[PDB]
């Protein structure tokens, strides 16, 4: 059954089984239209599709654009087939996905890189339109060909940018995978150290940091703990701003600015969808 997929110019090994129909799942390899995400049985069928397919980017509204990097907001009710295909594609790299078919309650934020043939998929995150638990990300994926290049952190940052604009505090949906956890820890460390590096006051509450960053209070405390920056001396809880962490962060900040792997909030053109 499905061990690889042909996706644009890439050949990708799958990590997990995804519930594609038996007709397709029986085959060793699937051929995907990189723009509309239709899955097909062969290279020749794919070629015939590519000759006819009108799509050169995701559906929905392009809400972020900085040069060749875009994010498209796709409504699972308005573009059901696309979003189902995206969820089946995603499950090939997720140990567990809570959802495939019933995509209507979700928004999908699809990040692309443009070149002269169109806007190519980098990754995405899904988000419930109405989350009872205030989750700002349901699932998140960077396509394998793009992994470990900074795009995952861009996606995470973007999810918190939406939350800030919504005047909400956000958290990723539990449970978090190994790679999910590492990524979020890295982002939270970056955000917290930036806040403390820019902050000049003598004391700070977790709530204030949460208000600025849109990061959940629990995730901030968890990060302070992870960096061993929560201390106890003379009956009081202190935030210990470590020298090595601040200095190491500025060196990383230099390399972050050296490349262009950052989301620029001035390149967001968004109001929360359909009033809601």
């Amino acid at each position: 059954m499905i061990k690889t997929i042909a996706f644009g110019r890439y050949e990708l090994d799958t990590w997990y089984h995804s519930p594609y129909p038996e007709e397709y799942a029986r085959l060793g390899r699937l051929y995907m239209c990189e723009f509309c995400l239709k899955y097909m049985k062969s290279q020749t069928i794919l070629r015939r599709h590519m000759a006819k397919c009108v799509w050169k980017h995701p559906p929905g509204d392009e809400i972020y654009r900085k040069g060749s990097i875009s994010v498209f907001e796709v409504d699972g009710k308005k573009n059901k087939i696309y979003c189902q295909n995206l969820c089946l594609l995603a499950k090939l790299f997720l140990d567990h996905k809570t959802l495939y078919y019933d995509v209507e309650p979700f928004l999908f934020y699809v990040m692309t890189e443009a070149d002269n043939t169109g806007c190519h998929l980098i990754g995405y995150f899904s988000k419930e339109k109405n989350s009872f638990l205030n989750y700002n990300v349901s699932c998140i994926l960077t396509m394998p060909q793009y992994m470990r290049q900074g795009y995952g952190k861009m996606l995470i940052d973007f999810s918190y940018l939406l939350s800030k604009v919504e005047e909400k505090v956000g958290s990723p949906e539990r449970p978090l995978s190994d790679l999910g956890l590492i990524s979020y820890r890295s982002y939270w460390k970056e955000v917290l150290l930036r806040y403390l590096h820019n902050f000049q006051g003598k004391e700070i509450s977790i709530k204030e940091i949460s208000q600025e960053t849109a990061v959940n209070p629990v995730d901030i405390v968890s990060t302070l703990q992870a960096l061993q920056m929560l201390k106890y001396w003379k009956g009081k809880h202190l935030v210990l701003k470590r020298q090595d962490l601040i200095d190491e962060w500025i060196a990383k900040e230099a390399k972050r600015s050296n490349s262009n792997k950052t989301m620029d909030p001035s390149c967001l053109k968004w109001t929360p969808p359909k009033g809601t």
Binding site: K202, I206, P217, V221, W233, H237, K241
Partner: peptide, 28 residues
Amino acid sequence: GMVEIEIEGRLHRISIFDPLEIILEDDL
């Protein structure tokens, strides 16, 4: 809103609304 964790083998409970003092190195 309170969170519990252990620092140096001691269990603590911390408020998310109270101002927390920020320190650089400073002996302690």
